[PDB]
Design an enzyme around this catalytic site. Structure first.
Site: not given
Ligand SMILES: *[B]([O])([O])[C]([C][C]([C])[C])[N]C(=O)[C]([C]C1=[C][C]=[C][C]=[C]1)[N]C(=O)C1=[C]N=[C][C]=N1
Ligand SMILES: [Mg+2]
Ligand SMILES: *[B]([O])([O])[C]([C][C]([C])[C])[N]C(=O)[C]([C]C1=[C][C]=[C][C]=[C]1)[N]C(=O)C1=[C]N=[C][C]=N1
Ligand SMILES: *[B]([O])([O])[C]([C][C]([C])[C])[N]C(=O)[C]([C]C1=[C][C]=[C][C]=[C]1)[N]C(=O)C1=[C]N=[C][C]=N1
Ligand SMILES: *[B]([O])([O])[C]([C][C]([C])[C])[N]C(=O)[C]([C]C1=[C][C]=[C][C]=[C]1)[N]C(=O)C1=[C]N=[C][C]=N1
Ligand SMILES: [Cl-]
Ligand SMILES: [Cl-]
Ligand SMILES: [Mg+2]
Ligand SMILES: [Mg+2]
Ligand SMILES: [Mg+2]
Ligand SMILES: [Mg+2]
Lengths: 212, 195, 196, 226, 222, 204, 233, 195, 196
Positions: D1, D166, D129, D19, D47, D33, D169, D17
């Site tokens: 992210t 990254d 990240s 993702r 997160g 986001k 992201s 972003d």
């Molecule tokens: B980013 O990478 O920080 C992103 C921001 C989010 C608020 C949209 N985070 C994620 O994509 C998280 C990563 C993660 C994985 C495992 C534990 C904690 C965080 N993903 C998720 O929260 C997620 C994963 N699968 C389905 C739905 N959400």
């Molecule tokens: Mg990338």
């Protein structure tokens, strides 16, 4: 994995499944779990794929060297004991193997030896090895007789693998059939479970639980 | 405890449950009945951790008997099984969960059909033609997949059950000291004294 | 442990406290951490007493054998022998050593050898648990080409502070002066350096 | 992210972003986001996705009730205080890492929030990240007295650095501009530099390719009359 | 504690044609959430009309390929410049892998080429030397995404013929080189979308009786 | 040990032209042991469809919970709940168990009765909403399903074409997963008719 | 198996039209203590190669001795040691890569990340990475440690792919490197202001720059930052 | 493996050993002979970890047979037992010890006396009138303490052995699939085919 | 983190670096660690940013409520409220706080509160990871009743050294002067304090 082998009137039946897995991932459906050691010796394989392939391929080299030196085919007992003595040297190192060494000789007749990476070596009439062995035992024990025709014995072995392929998640793919006689082993084809299941269900009237 | 089996045939449900009670290296008893009658046409067998099994079974029994008195009416097997499932589903997120697996065999007098439900300690319910808990299913499901036909009689069901017990007695390491067999049908619950 | 070596106009001076500890018990309050590997090549020892002694004894043997064959070794050569032992046996050793020596050609030199076994040639060096508390003081107060009296005062004031704050450091302040004139041993007692 | 916040002359801009990832798998390619706490207070979240969404909704809800109670437009410091005290109470277990920004009667504001409840003030900030890749761009190109056009450019460039460099992201760039004395403009998919190319082949199957056992109509309607 | 293994990501794909074979692999190289290189070749020409790739931990991958290339060289010296057949190469690679059974090369290996009858051949390996000839195989990080698609579109699994309704299967017609390259490109584009360790570029090595040809295609860089 | 892969199973959903499709396998097992081949994972409350993968006890519990809540919704609101609103209800309900969650992977599918717009959505176990235009995947073969959907899918497919795409996506993904398969069901959903098809697949 | 004690942080590098640039700061850290402020971490080999090393300094000094010994050994019985049979960047790298992988395979690694930058005989740019695991890779830009996370993104804006190399001059490339070093000083807690930079050009040869400093830093805006949220004074 | 028993009577030694071989949840075999003839008047039964048991027994067998050929003479049971003990005592401080417990039953032709030796995997030798390894002794020693007399006949010894097996079959949890019984006396070694 | 508070003739001066770190990454290079709990009672914060902020916010609330009821609180009273929070929640907090304030009656006062939650009234105090490196320097160079210009130089030189040696400390040197005259904020940039 489900592999079986049993002695009967017409020699030995050997039947195996074809599935390989890494955790829940299905790695292969087309694995050859019967190894043609020579025209009269077969080896089944279960557990670690590499361990089994490498050492049973190696076993064939040791059996070939025996008959070059002794001008006589190796006995099933001696062939099985070469493998069991080898894995015993490696005991504790983490080899993972469960095999049946199946074959026919004049002095022994039809013989099956179960050999295992803990060093266990057992002669016997019936064996089922692998994660789905219990499922195979259920069908095999209830229908087994010494006086079975080659045709009926082959079906029983095929049907026992099918039973395990259905219930055991780590067994499946297809069924490889072999028939070991006085004059050597005979291959009896690859049987895809995807087609064999529906064929057996309809004809045999079994699997009434499942809808088709 | 160890082995509990169930099979639903044409007009009845048959439950088979081992008699052995083993604590450690000794078989303390060889005539233990691992089941409780919840209602006149509903029987529950059970297996799991010591103490929990009986405590849970009797607790369920008391609740169903209470319902029967209050409404002057017998609950359907489906209704009883759902009640049992909810108790186990509630239990799994408790401080100390009930470590009990059960089979519920009942005859629905309304629909005139036998019914077999398999429920594990997590509260996982499934209706089945035949069922088992623990290591029993690893041997018995393959046999039942082959022989079971849905239109079987009660006598044919008992023969098929004998074939299951024989396989278990041959291939399982533990001596479970045979089984107590009970039949659930339109006339109620009865025990097969010779097996 | 509080140890240091400082180069100056006429040569180099080594300095050290005299405390050896097993946890909080002072096993030896009058320890000599300034030890001789050659006539005018000495070292300060910190870390394990056993390890640093065993190392120093081996180095003294190597330099004695070097002298018999090839004549007097350089300070750099002595530091290299220390390094070789500390680096190759890094997994099994806990030794923080400062090597200091005086040549006529190279004059005063100081090499520090921390835990890893790396070598660092410096104008002055500090080491041991007590050195942490005097990085600020030493950096602010060090000058190149100091006199003998100035360098003695610099070490005395520095180690005095290191002793004051570090529990693992204490006792007397030992010093060894290395110049063309020869080898001089100095000692300073608590009553002298505490009131500074 | 990758999420960023950039102050400028007459307001503040935030970007992100799109993702979302579960391990090495991309769960969502066009994730949103940028969250709205109040009309002119928005925050970007990094997160745990459920946590950033939930914590924003809760505080946003209480901010709305507070705005109605006081008859005043909500302030960024109120959202900041309510968010940090909530997150602190849960000792970092609520995995929400937020860049909070907005305009209010006091002026324009830009803050960051970490999961354990610590806040920071700045003219430019980045979290997630891809924050290192983004911060590298910000540290190289940021200056005082940025215009609106320059701040949007800098913010989106910082997100792009995260998108490309990254692995956490990717996909698109979302932006929200909050200028003083104006409506906040939410620019969903401001940039789209990752459109998938045309596939080489069409995998439309011939009808009847799949084997069927049974068919039946499902009754979705209510119980009927007559 | 020191961990001697690492994960460099990436994904590889081998497909066997009727008189040809392809071995494809993405050009991205990673550690954790960082990109090391957008173009780091992963599929190699090893001589004797054999192509090879060892995907997973790149250090072990390079070591293995280097040792196999070496094995091909010494095979020529020791056996009068005889061509190493694909089946013989596969068995040799098993012994290289199993030789480190108790400290494995952490890679999924695939080789491709032509068999002694001139037909297309692909062999696949696990880290400890187990191998098997296949018509189709994907390996590496995004193998779980690609293999099912290949079961469907190469071996026509779960596909039947219209009108018959599950009775008659779809016939296993052979695939041309142009048709295979389309499936490779779509496989990697799809994998790139949903797998973070896949992207940047796609490099395909095509093996025929004429020799070894190369083709390169751009992939998404996010 | 891992709750999300004790029982096994998968669910996939797709959008088409004026239609949506949701499909699931029929397996329920205890790790390696296959127990039931009739365990359906797709439920419906009015015209809104919900598929749930993961721990089977929680699959059952949540179905009973959302039946409970949608029935009370209907009595008070005097109308059936819509997919967009139901999606929020699922998210709310899952997040209230934030630090003691239901081990599930829900999937919502349906058509808005007023606007006629096709709608699908996916969730993680604690309530995060993934509202995709194209498709949603869930379960033990999610990696496999992602690969199939990402390659096979194209937008604006007709109902009878969409059936083929989602069916082939499920079947081939399940066949590469040990804990999925043992039968499959596909729901084809249009604004005022819903067809349910059981698929013939390999039983291993 | 060991743990690194005295450590060096990022090494950064990139290719340009006629050669390669590499840089690294002069710090030897001892955990959080910034112990040694005069450590040279760029080590030239001949007049055509520079090896930049990060990680454990004791192991760096070992590698430094291995390279010094490599030059000596290459000169033995070699009349063309300063001409056709001189050490190439590719030769020096492959040697190190062999050693690094051998040491990791004995479970006793050299705890380093290494970048070998140079120019080959035919004028081709050489830039390749190797670390404690024996992992190797090449790219138009390469960086170790924090550099990988912060420098690469900046350097990749200049040279994003291979075709951007001929379009990049030495002035533009050096400017990008110096800027990247400033960013690392802002954001890396184990970096120093003082650094060394090396340019290896196919025309002008090896230019080694010592005692460089990070300059033109932005800190003035700090005065306006007060408190952590609500505080005004 | 599981249960091995031994009893020394007036003029013979009787060894009883279970037939079951269990790997995991399956009984792979129900006719396994857990013994090896070391010499014409010396028999060794064994139980322990899989593989080690047979490997050790056959290794000992080979060594005793070698001695017999070299000297054209049969070693006394006492001599064989001491040899076996030393091998196990050597083994226990090896890289990978033999995880095997044994009973050695022999008839000394010189002294005209039966002899039973119990040796565990550590190399702990004891001469006994009756012996057992594993959990077997926990049931059988109390019975033998009561009934055994030192002047029993071979037929009386077999009856007393039947009483031990019956108790094991009643109270032990594992189904060991009966026992193979072998008698060692002045005439040599023979197997009781009906038991 | 390098923080300190120093009493002098006209009152007291607080000093701090501006670095916040997540491991080796500098999350904030312009942090304000000098924070206000009352008009002329401030504190220096070290340890966890979240913990010290939460504590400081609670203290500011308590002193604001104290002021409404009982008038301006003493510096000792402010230190006591800090102590109560740090001591009673010692298991869950990582906070090293220096409290400094100016009364007209008591003049400049400094209280330090380390991890345990104990209170220590001192003429001057140093804290944070970077303080270890300047114990020697500060002890040697501190005098009582210094002037404003002397005290600013003392803090500037001290924190400059702490920053130089501590990786966790850096950025700008912030200072806050507390006297009868009022509250003055001072800032010093790298180019100024590094060359000292
Ligand atoms: B980013 O990478 O920080 C992103 C921001 C989010 C608020 C949209 N985070 C994620 O994509 C998280 C990563 C993660 C994985 C495992 C534990 C904690 C965080 N993903 C998720 O929260 C997620 C994963 N699968 C389905 C739905 N959400
Ligand atoms: Mg990338
Ligand atoms: B069978 O299940 O034992 C099977 C036989 C083997 C010869 C293919 N083994 C495997 O599938 C094993 C996993 C396993 C499952 C169940 C019990 C024991 C082992 N897989 C592998 O050995 C393997 C090898 N290469 C790739 C993937 N999996
Ligand atoms: B000094 O404290 O480092 C000191 C130097 C030594 C050469 C005399 N070392 C010790 O006192 C060590 C323990 C130690 C304390 C602090 C830092 C590192 C090591 N003590 C011993 O080696 C010792 C203690 N008691 C008996 C024998 N050896
Ligand atoms: B200083 O280094 O102690 C500093 C003081 C803080 C009040 C700004 N603390 C930190 O930087 C801490 C970590 C730490 C480092 C050294 C000693 C003790 C603690 N950092 C954080 O609390 C932090 C870091 N990143 C985000 C949020 N919070
Ligand atoms: Cl000493
Ligand atoms: Cl802070
Ligand atoms: Mg052998
Ligand atoms: Mg002291
Ligand atoms: Mg199966
Ligand atoms: Mg004993």
């Amino acid at each position: 994995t489900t592999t079986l082998a049993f002695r009967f009137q017409g020699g030995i039946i050997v039947a195996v499944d074809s599935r390989a897995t890494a955790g829940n991932w299905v790695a292969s459906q087309t694995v050859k779990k019967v190894i043609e050691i020579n025209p009269f010796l077969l080896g089944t394989i279960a557990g670690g794929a590499a361990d089994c392939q490498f050492w049973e391929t190696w076993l064939g080299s040791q059996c070939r060297l025996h008959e070059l030196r002794e001008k006589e085919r190796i006995s099933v007992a001696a062939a099985s004991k070469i493998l069991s003595n080898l894995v015993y040297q490696y005991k504790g190192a983490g080899l993972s193997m469960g095999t049946m060494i199946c074959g026919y000789t004049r002095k022994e007749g039809p013989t099956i030896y179960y050999v295992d990476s803990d060093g266990t070596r057992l002669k016997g009439d019936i064996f089922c090895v692998g994660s789905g062995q219990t499922f195979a035992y259920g069908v095999l024990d209830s229908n087994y007789k010494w006086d079975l025709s080659v045709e009926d014995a082959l079906y029983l072995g095929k049907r026992s693998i099918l039973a395990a392929a259905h219930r055991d998640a780590y067994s499946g793919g297809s069924v490889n059939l072999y028939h070991v006689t006085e004059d050597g082993w005979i291959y009896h084809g690859n049987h895809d479970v995807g087609e064999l299941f529906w064929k057996v269900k309809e004809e045999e009237g079994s699997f009434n639980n499942v809808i088709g | 405890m160890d082995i509990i089996l169930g099979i639903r045939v044409q007009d009845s449900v048959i439950l088979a449950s081992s008699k052995a009670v083993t604590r450690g290296i000794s078989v303390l008893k060889d005539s233990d009945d691992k089941t409780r009658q919840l209602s006149p046409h509903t029987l529950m067998s059970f297996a799991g951790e010591a103490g929990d099994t009986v405590q849970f079974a009797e607790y369920i029994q008391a609740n169903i008997q209470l319902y029967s008195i209050r409404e002057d009416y017998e609950l359907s097997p489906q209704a009883v099984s759902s009640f049992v499932r909810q108790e186990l589903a509630k239990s799994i997120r408790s401080r100390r969960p009930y470590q009990v697996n059960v089979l519920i065999g009942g005859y629905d007098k309304k629909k005139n059909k036998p019914e077999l439900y398999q429920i594990d300690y997590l509260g996982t319910k499934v209706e089945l033609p035949y069922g088992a808990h623990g290591y029993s299913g690893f041997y018995t499901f393959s046999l039942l997949d082959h022989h079971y036909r849905p239109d079987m009689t009660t006598e044919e069901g008992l023969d098929l059950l004998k074939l299951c017990v024989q396989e278990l007695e041959k291939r399982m390491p533990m001596d479970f000291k045979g089984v107590i067999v009970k039949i659930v049908d339109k006339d109620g619950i009865r025990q097969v004294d010779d097996f | 442990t509080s140890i240091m070596a400082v180069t100056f106009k006429d040569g180099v001076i080594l300095g050290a406290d005299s405390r050896t500890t097993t946890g909080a018990y002072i096993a030896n309050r009058v320890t000599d951490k300034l030890t001789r590997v050659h006539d005018k090549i000495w070292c300060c020892r910190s870390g394990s007493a056993a390890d640093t002694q065993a190392i120093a004894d081996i180095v003294q043997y190597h330099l004695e054998l070097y002298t018999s064959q090839y004549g007097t070794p350089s300070t750099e050569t002595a530091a290299s022998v220390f390094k070789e032992l500390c680096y190759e046996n890094k997994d099994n050793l806990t030794a923080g050593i400062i090597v200091a020596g005086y040549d006529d050609k190279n004059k005063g030199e100081v090499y520090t050898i921390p835990l890893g076994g790396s070598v660092h040639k410096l104008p002055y060096a500090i080491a041991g648990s007590g050195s942490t508390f005097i990085y600020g003081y030493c950096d602010k107060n060090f000058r190149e080409n100091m006199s003998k009296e100035e360098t003695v005062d610099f070490i005395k004031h520095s180690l005095s502070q290191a002793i004051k704050w570090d529990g693992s450091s204490g006792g007397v302040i030992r010093m060894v002066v290395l110049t063309a004139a020869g080898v001089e041993r100095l000692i300073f007692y608590p009553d002298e350096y505490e009131q500074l | 992210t990758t999420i960023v916040g950039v102050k400028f002359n007459n307001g503040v801009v935030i970007a992100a972003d799109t993702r979302s990832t579960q391990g090495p798998i991309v769960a969502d390619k066009n994730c949103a986001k940028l969250h709205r706490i109040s009309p002119k207070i928005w925050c970007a979240g990094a997160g745990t996705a459920a946590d950033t969404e939930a914590v924003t909704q809760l505080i946003g809800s209480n901010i709305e009730l507070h705005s109605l109670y006081t008859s005043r437009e909500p302030r960024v410091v109120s959202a900041l205080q309510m968010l940090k005290q909530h997150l602190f109470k849960y000792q970092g277990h609520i995995g929400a890492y937020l860049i909070v920004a907005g305009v209010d009667p006091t002026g324009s504001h830009l803050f960051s929030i970490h999961a354990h409840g610590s806040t920071d003030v700045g003219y430019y900030l980045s979290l997630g990240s891809g924050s290192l890749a983004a911060m590298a761009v910000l540290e190289s190109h940021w200056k005082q007295d940025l215009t609106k056009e320059e701040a949007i450019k800098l913010a989106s460039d910082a997100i792009q650095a995260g998108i490309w460099n990254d692995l956490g992201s990717g996909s698109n760039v979302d932006v929200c501009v909050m200028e003083i004395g104006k409506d906040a403009e939410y620019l969903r998919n401001y940039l789209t530099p990752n459109v998938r190319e045309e596939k080489q082949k069409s995998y439309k199957f011939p009808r009847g390719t799949t084997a069927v056992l049974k068919e039946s109509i499902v009754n979705i309607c209510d119980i009927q009359e007559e | 504690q020191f961990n001697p293994y690492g994960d460099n990501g990436g994904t590889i794909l081998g497909i066997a044609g009727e008189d040809f074979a392809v071995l494809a692999g993405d050009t991205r190289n990673i550690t954790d959430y960082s990109i090391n290189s957008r173009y780091e070749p992963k599929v190699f020409d090893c001589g004797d009309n054999i192509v090879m790739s060892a995907n997973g931990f790149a250090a072990d991958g390079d070591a293995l390929v280097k040792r196999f290339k070496n094995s091909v060289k010494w095979y020529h010296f020791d056996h009068n410049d005889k061509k190493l057949s694909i089946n013989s190469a596969a068995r040799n690679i098993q012994h290289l892998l199993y030789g480190k059974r108790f400290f494995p090369y952490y890679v999924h290996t695939i080789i491709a080429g032509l068999d002694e009858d001139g037909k297309g051949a692909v062999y696949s390996f696990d880290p400890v030397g187990s191998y098997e000839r296949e018509q189709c195989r994907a390996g590496g990080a995004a193998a779980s995404l690609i293999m099912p698609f290949l079961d469907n579109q190469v071996n026509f699994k779960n596909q039947y013929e219209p009108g018959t309704n599950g009775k008659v299967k779809k016939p296993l017609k052979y695939l041309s080189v142009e048709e295979v390259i389309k499936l490779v490109r779509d496989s990697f584009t799809s994998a790139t979308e949903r797998h973070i360790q896949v992207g940047d570029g796609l490099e395909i090595l095509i093996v025929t009786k004429d020799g070894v040809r190369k083709e390169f295609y751009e992939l998404k860089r996010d | 040990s891992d709750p999300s892969s004790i029982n096994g199973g998968i669910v996939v959903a797709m959008t088409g032209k004026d239609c949506v499709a949701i499909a699931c396998d029929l397996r329920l097992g205890s790790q390696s042991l296959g127990v039931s081949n009739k365990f359906e994972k797709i439920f419906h409350y009015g015209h809104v469809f919900l598929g749930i993968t993961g721990l089977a006890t929680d699959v059952t519990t949540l179905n009973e919970m959302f039946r409970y809540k949608t029935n009370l919704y209907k009595l008070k609101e005097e109308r059936a709940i819509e997919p967009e609103t139901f999606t929020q209800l699922v998210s709310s309900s899952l997040y209230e168990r934030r630090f003691g969650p239901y081990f599930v992977g829900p999937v919502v599918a349906g058509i808005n009765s007023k606007s006629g717009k096709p709608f699908i959505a996916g969730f993680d176990l604690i309530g995060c909403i993934d509202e995709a235009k194209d498709f949603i995947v869930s379960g033990t073969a999610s990696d496999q399903l992602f690969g199939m959907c990402e390659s096979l899918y194209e937008p604006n497919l007709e109902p009878e074409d969409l059936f083929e795409t989602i069916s082939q996506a499920l079947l081939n993904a399940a066949d590469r997963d040990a804990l999925s398969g043992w039968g499959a069901v596909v729901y084809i959903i249009k604004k005022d008719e819903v067809v349910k098809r059981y698929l013939k697949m390999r039983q291993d | 198996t060991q743990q690194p004690i005295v450590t060096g942080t990022s090494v950064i590098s990139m290719k340009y039209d006629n050669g390669v640039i590499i840089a690294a700061d002069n710090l030897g850290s001892y955990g959080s203590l910034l112990r040694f402020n005069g450590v040279e971490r760029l080590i030239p080999v001949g007049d055509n190669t520079v090896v930049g090393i990060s990680g454990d300094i004791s192991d760096m000094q070992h590698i430094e001795r291995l390279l010094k010994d490599l030059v000596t050994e290459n000169a033995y019985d070699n009349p063309l040691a300063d001409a056709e049979e001189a050490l190439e960047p590719s030769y020096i790298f492959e040697y190190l890569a062999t050693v690094m992988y051998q040491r990791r395979s004995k479970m006793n690694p050299l705890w380093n990340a290494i970048i070998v930058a140079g120019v080959q005989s035919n004028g081709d740019q050489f830039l390749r990475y190797v670390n404690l695991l024996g992992v190797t890779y090449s790219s138009p830009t390469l960086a170790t440690g924090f550099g990988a996370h912060m420098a690469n993104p900046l350097l990749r804006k200049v040279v994003d792919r291979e075709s951007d190399i001929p379009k990049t001059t030495v002035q533009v490339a050096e400017e990008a490197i110096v800027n990247a070093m400033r960013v690392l000083y802002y954001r890396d807690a184990r970096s120093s202001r003082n650094f060394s930079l090396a340019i290896i050009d196919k025309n002008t040869g090896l230019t080694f720059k010592k005692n460089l400093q990070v300059e033109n830093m932005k800190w003035d805006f700090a005065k306006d930052i007060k408190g952590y949220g609500t505080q005004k004074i």
